[PDB]
Write a structure and sequence with these properties.
The structure is cut from a larger assembly and holds one copy of chain A (about 100 residues) and two copies of chain B (about 220 residues).
Chain A: E1 7-11, H1 19-22, E2 48-52
Antiparallel strand pairs in A: 1-2
Chain B: E1 18-19, E2 33-38, E3 46-51, E4 57-59, E5 68-69, E6 80-82, E7 95-98, E8 121-123, E9 136-142, E10 151-156, E11 163-167, E12 171-172, E13 180-185, E14 188-193, E15 203-208, E16 215-216
Antiparallel strand pairs in B: 1-6, 2-3, 2-7, 3-4, 5-6, 8-9, 9-14, 10-11, 10-15, 11-12, 13-14, 15-16
The chains are: A little secondary structure (about 100), B mainly beta (about 220).
């Protein structure tokens, strides 16, 4: 889904698999905060949500615990209790159109 | 990859309590020296507190007792709890690691703003408007006349965190171009920029360390005629 | 019949304070964007500040912190405070609503003048002196190669306020007649004026938006051989 209608999915009771998160080289914008970037298997907070959108280009950097802008004024906003963080991807011909 | 958090952009009611947090990006916080500085916009920077490895804490002379900074090894964080705050305490609250002998505040946080209700060290030159293509001299003087290697130079950036230029006036930090030089001894120290670049118009500060509570200079800016 | 009035024609003492004023004539300032642009006579136009609905303000890269802009909905004003000012600040301070995506600077203010004490976007052709009776081509190149529709065109006038010609290089603004056309993609955008009329000889600018701080062209003038 797009940014204007951002979709969320709650992860139910299951054993968290975070080992392949850091060993994957496909992640190049894991500039994110919160808990320590090593003890992910030692934390099992009660509920976890994953929210997805397709914002473009350099607008991703405005996602921060407290920020304003054309994206972070009338769209997804980050509070000061945002435990967890953000993973970004890279665009290609998979999401593209010549026309 | 160094990475730090400072997220306290929230208005506080009079006589309120505020909770800060500085995180970590791979390095343990209990094995290295932690430090906090108050930017004090409209003037030079100032020191606030230092968290030693262990947990022994050192506070500044201005604030005694009311400040309470704690370290959480379970969550790898550097919390600070401000109790009832008073007037003229609105400033930026930078946090960093400290290796004063070898690199003074090499990395920094990201900055934050906290609102309110409703050693004698100076810097001589001033604005010193100049144009690219030549060199310039910046002089920092002290009244205590520290002997050799207890002065550091920092480059403030508009809206960003400071960057360490030289530590001890003897060795520059890594990533610093070869166009920065330093000299001087006794009470006065000089910094020189060569082949001025457009990506260099920034405020320069000199901070004294290895002594009584840390003091910065007033602040020297760069301008083009 | 929208009108944007300004009144700031006053001399300033060294390090003085001034307060500009921009009003509204029918549209509320609490639901539309406002922006300020520096005319910089003898050079192309630049940018100062943008305010969104809400009231978060973004400043230019050159000027940081010292500017203080504010909105007063009770009196419907767009106040801007100039504090102690330095050299090289004498220019016009146009204020205009910003709808860059759908119409770039459709209406402007009237202009003013404040004195002093005592993206790589370029326009290729130049003067290109010609005579009425044919067409002409104006080329604007951008180094970042903005994708589709993030460049607009402006027309000046001696002593008057700047006017909008085309937004997004695809469709002209309201009141713009069919003697102006635009095309081009990738790196260069071309504009063509057919059947030259006496009320067409004016400075033509190309401006970029939808990106990092807005930049205008150096300035292309129309002259008669």
């Amino acid at each position: 889904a797009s940014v204007y209608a951002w979709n969320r999915k709650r992860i139910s009771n299951c054993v968290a698999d975070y080992s392949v998160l850091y060993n994957s080289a496909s992640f190049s914008t894991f500039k994110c905060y919160g808990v320590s970037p090593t003890k992910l298997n030692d934390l099992c907070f009660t509920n976890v949500y994953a929210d997805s959108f397709v914002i473009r280009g350099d607008e991703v950097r405005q996602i921060a615990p407290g920020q304003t802008g054309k994206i972070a004024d009338y769209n997804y906003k980050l509070p000061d209790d945002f435990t967890g963080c953000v993973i970004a991807w890279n665009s290609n011909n998979l999401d593209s159109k010549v026309g | 990859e160094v990475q730090l958090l400072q997220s306290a952009g929230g208005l506080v009611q009079p006589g309120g309590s505020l909770r800060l947090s500085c995180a970590a990006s791979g390095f343990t916080v209990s094995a290295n020296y932690m430090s906090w500085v108050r930017q004090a916009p409209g003037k030079g920077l100032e020191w606030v507190s230092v968290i030693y490895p262990g947990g022994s804490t050192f506070y500044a002379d201005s604030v005694k007792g009311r400040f309470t900074i704690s370290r959480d090894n379970s969550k790898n964080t550097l919390y600070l709890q401000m109790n009832s705050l008073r007037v003229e305490d609105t400033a930026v609250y930078y946090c960093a690691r400290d290796l004063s002998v070898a690199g003074a505040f090499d990395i920094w946080g990201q900055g934050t703003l906290v609102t309110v209700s409703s050693i004698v060290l100076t810097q001589s030159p001033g604005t010193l408007s100049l144009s690219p293509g030549e060199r310039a001299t910046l002089s920092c003087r002290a009244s205590q006349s520290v002997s050799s290697s207890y002065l550091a130079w920092y480059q403030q950036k508009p809206g960003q965190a400071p960057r360490l230029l030289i530590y001890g006036a003897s060795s520059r930090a890594t990533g610093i171009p070869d166009r920065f030089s330093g000299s001087g001894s006794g009470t006065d120290f000089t910094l020189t920029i060569s082949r001025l670049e457009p990506e260099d118009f920034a405020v320069y500060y000199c901070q004294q360390y290895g002594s009584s509570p840390y003091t910065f200079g007033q602040g020297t800016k760069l301008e083009i005629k």
